[PDB]
From TrEMBL, chains A, B, C:
It comes from Influenza A virus (A/Michigan/15/2014(H3N2)). One of its GO terms (molecular function) is host cell surface receptor binding. The gene is HA. It is found in: Host apical cell membrane; Virion membrane. Disulfide bonds join C44-C269, C56-C68, C89-C131, C273-C297. In natural infection, inactive HA is matured into HA1 and HA2 outside the cell by one or more trypsin-like, arginine-specific endoprotease secreted by the bronchial epithelial cells. One identified protease that may be involved in this process is secreted in lungs by club cells. Palmitoylated. One of its GO terms (cellular component) is membrane. Glycans are attached at N30, N55, N125, N238. GO terms for biological process: clathrin-dependent endocytosis of virus by host cell; fusion of virus membrane with host endosome membrane; fusion of virus membrane with host plasma membrane; viral budding from plasma membrane; virion attachment to host cell. It is a single-pass type I membrane protein. Homotrimer of disulfide-linked HA1-HA2. This is Hemagglutinin. The chain holds residues 27 to 341 of 566 of the full protein.
Amino acid sequence: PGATLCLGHHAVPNGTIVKTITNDRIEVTNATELVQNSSIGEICDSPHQILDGENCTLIDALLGDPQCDGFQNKKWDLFVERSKAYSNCYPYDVPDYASLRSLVASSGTLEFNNESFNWTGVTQNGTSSACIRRSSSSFFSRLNWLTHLNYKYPALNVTMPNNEQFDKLYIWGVHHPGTDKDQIFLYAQSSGRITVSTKRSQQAVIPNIGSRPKIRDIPSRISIYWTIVKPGDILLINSTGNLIAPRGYFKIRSGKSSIMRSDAPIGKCKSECITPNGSIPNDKPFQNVNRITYGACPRYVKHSTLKLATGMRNVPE
Amino acid sequence: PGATLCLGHHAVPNGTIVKTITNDRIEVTNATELVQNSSIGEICDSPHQILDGENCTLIDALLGDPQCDGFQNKKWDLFVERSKAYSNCYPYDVPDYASLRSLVASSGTLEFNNESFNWTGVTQNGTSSACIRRSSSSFFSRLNWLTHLNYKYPALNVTMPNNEQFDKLYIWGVHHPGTDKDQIFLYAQSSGRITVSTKRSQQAVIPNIGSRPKIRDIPSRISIYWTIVKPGDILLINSTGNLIAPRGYFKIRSGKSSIMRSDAPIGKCKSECITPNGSIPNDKPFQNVNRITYGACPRYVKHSTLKLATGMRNVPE
Amino acid sequence: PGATLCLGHHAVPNGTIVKTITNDRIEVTNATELVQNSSIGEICDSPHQILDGENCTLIDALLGDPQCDGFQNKKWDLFVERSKAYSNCYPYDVPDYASLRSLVASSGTLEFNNESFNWTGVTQNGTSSACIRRSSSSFFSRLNWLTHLNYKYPALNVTMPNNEQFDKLYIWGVHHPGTDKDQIFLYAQSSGRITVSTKRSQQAVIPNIGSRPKIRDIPSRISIYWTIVKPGDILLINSTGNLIAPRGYFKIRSGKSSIMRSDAPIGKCKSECITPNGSIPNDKPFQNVNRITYGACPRYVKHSTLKLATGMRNVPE
Ligand SMILES: *[C@@H]1O[C@H](CO)[C@@H](O[C@@H]2O[C@H](CO)[C@@H](O[C@@H]3O[C@H](CO)[C@@H](O)[C@H](O)[C@@H]3O)[C@H](O)[C@H]2NC(C)=O)[C@H](O)[C@H]1NC(C)=O
Ligand SMILES: *[C@@H]1O[C@H](CO)[C@@H](O[C@@H]2O[C@H](CO)[C@@H](O[C@@H]3O[C@H](CO)[C@@H](O)[C@H](O)[C@@H]3O)[C@H](O)[C@H]2NC(C)=O)[C@H](O)[C@H]1NC(C)=O
Ligand SMILES: *[C@@H]1O[C@H](CO)[C@@H](O[C@@H]2O[C@H](CO)[C@@H](O[C@@H]3O[C@H](CO)[C@@H](O)[C@H](O)[C@@H]3O)[C@H](O)[C@H]2NC(C)=O)[C@H](O)[C@H]1NC(C)=O
Ligand SMILES: *[C@@H]1O[C@H](CO)[C@@H](O[C@@H]2O[C@H](CO)[C@@H](O)[C@H](O)[C@H]2NC(C)=O)[C@H](O)[C@H]1NC(C)=O
Ligand SMILES: *[C@@H]1O[C@H](CO)[C@@H](O[C@@H]2O[C@H](CO)[C@@H](O)[C@H](O)[C@H]2NC(C)=O)[C@H](O)[C@H]1NC(C)=O
Ligand SMILES: *[C@@H]1O[C@H](CO)[C@@H](O[C@@H]2O[C@H](CO)[C@@H](O)[C@H](O)[C@H]2NC(C)=O)[C@H](O)[C@H]1NC(C)=O
Ligand SMILES: *[C@@H]1O[C@H](CO)[C@@H](O[C@@H]2O[C@H](CO)[C@@H](O)[C@H](O)[C@H]2NC(C)=O)[C@H](O)[C@H]1NC(C)=O
Ligand SMILES: *[C@@H]1O[C@H](CO)[C@@H](O[C@@H]2O[C@H](CO)[C@@H](O)[C@H](O)[C@H]2NC(C)=O)[C@H](O)[C@H]1NC(C)=O
Ligand SMILES: *[C@@H]1O[C@H](CO)[C@@H](O[C@@H]2O[C@H](CO)[C@@H](O)[C@H](O)[C@H]2NC(C)=O)[C@H](O)[C@H]1NC(C)=O
Ligand SMILES: *[C@@H]1O[C@H](CO)[C@@H](O)[C@H](O)[C@H]1NC(C)=O
Ligand SMILES: *[C@@H]1O[C@H](CO)[C@@H](O)[C@H](O)[C@H]1NC(C)=O
Ligand SMILES: *[C@@H]1O[C@H](CO)[C@@H](O)[C@H](O)[C@H]1NC(C)=O
Ligand SMILES: *[C@@H]1O[C@H](CO)[C@@H](O)[C@H](O)[C@H]1NC(C)=O
Ligand SMILES: *[C@@H]1O[C@H](CO)[C@@H](O)[C@H](O)[C@H]1NC(C)=O
Ligand SMILES: *[C@@H]1O[C@H](CO)[C@@H](O)[C@H](O)[C@H]1NC(C)=O
Ligand SMILES: *[C@@H]1O[C@H](CO)[C@@H](O)[C@H](O)[C@H]1NC(C)=O
Ligand SMILES: *[C@@H]1O[C@H](CO)[C@@H](O)[C@H](O)[C@H]1NC(C)=O
Ligand SMILES: *[C@@H]1O[C@H](CO)[C@@H](O)[C@H](O)[C@H]1NC(C)=O
């Protein structure tokens, strides 16, 4: 009579197709997806400190456009710039805009310390109807539009030492008036010149008078520049007109801070990984949601799906 | 008596040596090469639309050097620049030449639309004996050399709105005459100034008078600049002399177009992959022909040969 | 009675833990480390030709700061810049400093050939008390500070052809004096202008008069520029004041030369691979000593240890 003893393995009714080195379609008992392909559609506000820029670019929060006053001295891990953002102050450009945005985003703070420059022989606090703060002609909060006093603009030659233990970031500008009349009306002479220097750097700018296409009726422009002053170094601002002066300095830190362009809403939840589409889970090693990421994120790949086998070959019958 | 039954495998007289993880030389029955190591020596004219630059660089076809007139309004997938190319018009330089070449190559068209600027109070259509078109002093086809009329050069302040649905690329320049005599002879005053602006950009250039080493007897130079004008934006050209003006705009597209330096002839054949050496087959995943490629190409590697085993270990006797 | 024959394998009392695809800790009989994690703490002077910069940056050895006179005409495979380096000549900056440093480091030579420019109508060999050579006011060895002769500075317009078979690298500058008095005291007129050109390039610089913060009592600055002249091309130096002129050219080679910042001492020993920490052995394929390397080096990785099994699984008892 005897007996029979059969050795065997399980199978399932609902197997999953995976790829191998030798077969592009083979059925296994179970698999798990390694490419995260979805976001929750919102940026979770923990654990990273998120600053929603709302109507303001980071640079407009830096300069101090009036709609951005609530951003003064704020800090962030990630600044979120919205596509609806708009400027509503004096028209300006920034040569190497991208670099200024980057270095400020990376620093993660708009901490600003006022300094007294002793501007002697000029009118301070120039305003404009293109920059309205509380129904009143105004200007960039962190900039000081210096004009003539008594049809005189004497040569400024001003020193600000850095006696602190941290670096200072000075933001300043140069006014390019629309016509020759304006050049005289504000600075009482035809040729501006600005030199901003330290021991190790010098930035000399000549204004360029003329019409640019009008933005809120203004054919003139301000061009923005920046200067970092190390401890033991000295800012030296030598100018004879057309200086849009600093009111102080920004702290410049190094850390983990950045900036991202997104229109996703901010939600009350926890997620380590942020993309412009929203936060994504980070269990999986890869993702195809967005090449732009911040935090502990799966690596971006161009595959919609990669299934890792977690069981044997499925052999029904 | 009984029988014998032997199990076995084939072998071949002409095996091939491959590399493995454990052995750098092992013989298998057959292998296939994964590194493409040869080109046909010519650039196949299908499936990619090839434009042979012949004696012309892309920038000379853009500006409109007289030998390049046949390139007006042409389109390409790949522009091929030959090493025999030479310029034969007024000497010029392009600050950030590489970027202009790149953006035009990438756009893939020299489609040009003429516009009427209404230059009032200046002579248009200045010519030079260094730029000969049909045995006649001439100039860049797409540029307009403006000089004085009646020893007067009044301040130009000219607007061209972009009311189209596509971007416009303006190419223009600044004449740097050789001596002070020339500055007066052409512009009837000593100091040129050019400002070209949009709502968002401004490019201000001062000419610089003096001798550069002569090229076809010319110690003067033109410097070339470009300006992109978006829909709803406005070009504004404010100048008091030394303007080499645009006659219109180039369409600027985005697509799959590029440029390549090669001396390989163009042939009538089909090949997806182009290198400077010529077209290469793209069956193999890798190639060692050239790091420069266009199209569906094997990836460049620093290996002359990589043989993939396609059979068992070859064990003769 | 019969016999027993047992098949088996060795084991050791002192096994080593390795990682596999399926197990992060498994014991094998032996392993070898693939990440080099230590340096000898000194830069071996063979087989690479090492030039210890000591108190001198490469740029100070180029210009010819007096403490760097021993570097004249030296060659290197690797120039080593020390953190104690300091400048002790006239204060200067170099726009795109990084690029000048790179191209000279890569060239691997300070071979300098004097040329006669025939400076006619100017005083040559201007000196300064900020640049002391042998207890005597002096200047950069490779630069020629041209000032007025008899309160006249006539317009220089000087040509130097390259009739050699190699490229020439010209280094030159522009003096930015501290005040308007100085501008007259040295150049006997208010407006300098410098144009340096070749057939294919032009560099026009305007000086900018004013105070920068003093360095060894000097509020003025020299700005350094460079020009490469190919065979058959011509240097043309057109200037009306404020030219810090070249005394000749540097040979510019291409080869395997570079530069490294390190404070490690130089030792008498042989090692193919150099890092800022010192030379490292290059038997192993990887290293975690430094991302900065020169020579035949293991590849930098972010792992402290990677043990490759060199024996079977160790199964004691
Ligand atoms: C150089 O030319 C430009 C272009 O014409 C001049 O700027 C233009 O000035 C006019 C006159 O004020 C502006 O027109 C006005 O527009 C407003 C806005 O809707 C409207 O309310 C008025 O009825 C009038 O049409 C126009 O905006 C402006 N154009 C641009 C592109 O900025 C400029 O004045 C000239 N330069 C000098 C120094 O005059
Ligand atoms: C600044 O100096 C330069 C260099 O000497 C002057 O340019 C030179 O001008 C001469 C005189 O016309 C040119 O010489 C001629 O060359 C042709 C070409 O083969 C030949 O047919 C003539 O017999 C004569 O030798 C020379 O080409 C030219 N050199 C360079 C490098 O461009 C320049 O004129 C001076 N600046 C001013 C404003 O005068
Ligand atoms: C523009 O303003 C600056 C800043 O005040 C002026 O430069 C400064 O000039 C003074 C006077 O010589 C220097 O002070 C001296 O310092 C030395 C060094 O220890 C000391 O021995 C003297 O007793 C005296 O205190 C000062 O160094 C210098 N400051 C800087 C930052 O460079 C400059 O002179 C003004 N511009 C013009 C054209 O005058
Ligand atoms: C198929 O395999 C996956 C991965 O092994 C299983 O998913 C895990 O399930 C456990 C429950 O025991 C969870 O705690 C884990 O979070 C899951 N891991 C992952 C990576 O998702 C899944 O349960 C398996 N399915 C079956 C039917 O056994
Ligand atoms: C996440 O956002 C990206 C970027 O917006 C989305 O990818 C874009 O999708 C649009 C329209 O669907 C395409 O026209 C673009 O070409 C895509 N951009 C890129 C860079 O590929 C993406 O679909 C979003 N993903 C998820 C899961 O929401
Ligand atoms: C050695 O192996 C290669 C690859 O398997 C064979 O080359 C293929 O041959 C077929 C003919 O049946 C062609 O249609 C394919 O285009 C070839 N493939 C490649 C990648 O070249 C080759 O024939 C084999 N040699 C022998 C003797 O069997
Ligand atoms: C394809 O073209 C390249 C570039 O011309 C060739 O590689 C060069 O060959 C020359 C002389 O034979 C060498 O001096 C260069 O160093 C090579 N350049 C590079 C970048 O490596 C290459 O041999 C050609 N290949 C084929 C198959 O024709
Ligand atoms: C453990 O394995 C390593 C690598 O196989 C052995 O190290 C080698 O030892 C030989 C001596 O026969 C030396 O010549 C080599 O330079 C060593 N190679 C490396 C990469 O270090 C080691 O000896 C083995 N240990 C034992 C006990 O067998
Ligand atoms: C080799 O040198 C590097 C660079 O100096 C050392 O790494 C730095 O160590 C300091 C202090 O120990 C840290 O503050 C830095 O963050 C490190 N720099 C980087 C870029 O990581 C390194 O320890 C040295 N390695 C050895 C083996 O000596
Ligand atoms: C942003 O700007 C829009 C349009 O001007 C305005 O209606 C809205 O209230 C602003 N929102 C914030 C948060 O400032
Ligand atoms: C200018 O404005 C600043 C900042 O608000 C203020 O402290 C100061 O009173 C004003 N100064 C002058 C000179 O009007
Ligand atoms: C500041 O520079 C201007 C011109 O750049 C000059 O007139 C003035 O003397 C300088 N400052 C002083 C007070 O020296
Ligand atoms: C290109 O230039 C050469 C030399 O000037 C000339 O002989 C040739 O005909 C030109 N070829 C074309 C296609 O324009
Ligand atoms: C200048 O040349 C253009 C383009 O060929 C032509 O349309 C026009 O007739 C000329 N204009 C003047 C003012 O001579
Ligand atoms: C154009 O600019 C010049 C100087 O830049 C100026 O004289 C002129 O007024 C400007 N155009 C007009 C007509 O306003
Ligand atoms: C380098 O400079 C220091 C400090 O001035 C000096 O004491 C030392 O002798 C110098 N060393 C060399 C090698 O020039
Ligand atoms: C200037 O110095 C150079 C280099 O030391 C020397 O050859 C020459 O004699 C001097 N020239 C004049 C004009 O004083
Ligand atoms: C050199 O340039 C200056 C102004 O840039 C000019 O006055 C002079 O004529 C030029 N050289 C000569 C001798 O032509």
